[PDB]
Amino acid sequence: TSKETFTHYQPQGNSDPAHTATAPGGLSAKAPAMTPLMLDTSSRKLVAWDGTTDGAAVGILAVAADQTSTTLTFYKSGTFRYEDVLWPEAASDETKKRTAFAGTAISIV
């Protein structure tokens, strides 16, 4: 419990001391946590990963979310457990998902 601050709120500027991202939510259905997700380019929203799109995974959802989620809290980087991460069946090749975070600061094993 601690809230004390007052400054000219500005829509241009966002930074958190944590190592996670918080999107305004833009899913289309309910999805469990501990899984990779994809970030839109135009709508700039965070939605569950398709499973096919190569290099679509941008981060892993920390807490399960749904299309009704107004805010999604997913990771940004760090070594995560693949044996636990619930990858989408769409992934026909094991190497496909294992390399879904190609380009980001995320490294899964």
Q: Domain ranges in the chain?
A: 19-109
Burial class (CB in 10 A: 0-12, 13-18, 19+), 8: exposed
Query: Cα(35)–Cα(49) distance, rounded to whole angstroms?
Result: 8
Q: In the β-sheet with 20-23, what is the strand arrangement from edge to edge? A: 20-23, 72-75, 57-61, 35-39, 46-48
CATH of domain 19-109: 2.40.300.10
Contact (CB, 8 A) for 47 and 74? no
Q: Read off the DSSP letter of residue 35.
A: E
Strand 35-39 with 46-48, pairing: antiparallel
| C-alpha closest to that of 85 among 50, 30, 49, 34 | 34
